[PDB]
Design a protein around this ligand. Structure first.
Ligand SMILES: O=c1cc[nH]c(=O)[nH]1
Ligand SMILES: O=c1cc[nH]c(=O)[nH]1
Lengths: 201, 201
């Protein structure tokens, strides 16, 4: 129920996200997340009883933000239209919450030492469910023949690139996703290549 | 053509790759690399005169392997044909050099503090050139109305994804790129999407 209690959790998690994304799992101290969140170690431990708990809690939060649109897919959506929106939402999150993207990525680079079993469990189940859905777009003629998972990965890869690889994107273009023009150019290009790449012909 | 020299340089670069990717730039000490490599610190310093130099060297290796195919591009090439093969080769290097790929990615996550000059200098310079080429194919009607820079980033993103997000790919797929049937499934699919997506119509 409680909004106060949620406000406090979100503050700890937000503070945690920022520290972890700078110092890493092993480099980060609970003492510092507490300082930045404006709460005591005791209070932090009361909500997240181990650094491992907290860290997993922030990573899960990113997944929920990311997977929302995909969880929202239903058997009778217009597929191409749904995918365009998913791409858009994913690029919005790369612009808005790039440190989220970065931490998730950091954890991957280390081998998902903490998040692995979460990927093999909840994530896989969710992807299996929506792969079937997509295969059914394919089976019914609404999409070109494409393997669902590689398509799902492609959306993830191509949208997260702009946060994760921002320094390189900036290096070559002079721009970041916070330039409204460049955001739009990016959305148009990622959408076109992907969507035209899966449009039925 | 000097036997023990060649061998030490390789021992140092490999030791450097492994150590940096565990502990990061600042977590690493030259002593560790030297130790791991079976050379003294002084010896190492003759091959590479600072920690910064060594680190740019390992990342410069994977940069040259990645870019090889792109430097190859010329005005008269069949554009689809060439993009097809580029995708194939990029995924090959994801299969074979995933640790190198991961380190490049980490440097990106860090803001590219140490690599920026390379990105803003030589790499930009190259991508500007090969952008012009690709820009050419589009102008002449040989490709769809695309922005070269973003097509290149999607190739990078989708192909490097299978190395950098390998645990997640395996998590949902049960496969890695070492599994031949998965490797081919990945290439066909990444190719199918990007290629169909940039085909002129
Ligand atoms: O959107 C998502 C969801 C899970 N993993 C990702 O890399 N991206
Ligand atoms: O393949 C490449 C080449 C340059 N930079 C990347 O990130 N990937």
């Amino acid at each position: 129920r409680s909004r106060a209690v949620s406000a406090k959790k979100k503050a700890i998690l937000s503070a945690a996200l920022d520290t972890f994304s700078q110092f890493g799992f092993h480099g980060t101290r609970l003492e510092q997340i507490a300082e930045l969140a404006g709460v005591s170690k005791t209070n932090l431990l009361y909500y997240f009883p181990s650094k491992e708990a907290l860290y997993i809690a922030v990573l899960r939060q990113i997944l929920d933000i990311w997977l929302a649109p995909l969880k929202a897919f239903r058997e009778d959506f217009a597929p191409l239209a749904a995918i365009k929106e998913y791409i858009r939402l994913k690029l919005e999150v790369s612009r808005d919450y790039p440190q989220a993207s970065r931490l998730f990525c950091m954890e991957m680079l280390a081998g998902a030492p903490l998040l692995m079993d979460e990927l093999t469990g909840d994530l896989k189940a969710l992807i299996d469910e929506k792969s079937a859905l997509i295969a059914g777009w394919v089976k019914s003629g609404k999409l070109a023949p494409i393997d669902p998972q590689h398509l799902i990965f492609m959306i993830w890869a191509s949208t997260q690139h702009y946060a994760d690889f921002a320094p390189q994107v900036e290096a070559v273009t002079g721009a970041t996703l916070r330039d409204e023009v460049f955001f739009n150019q990016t959305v148009e290009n990622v959408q076109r290549i992907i969507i035209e790449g899966i449009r039925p012909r």
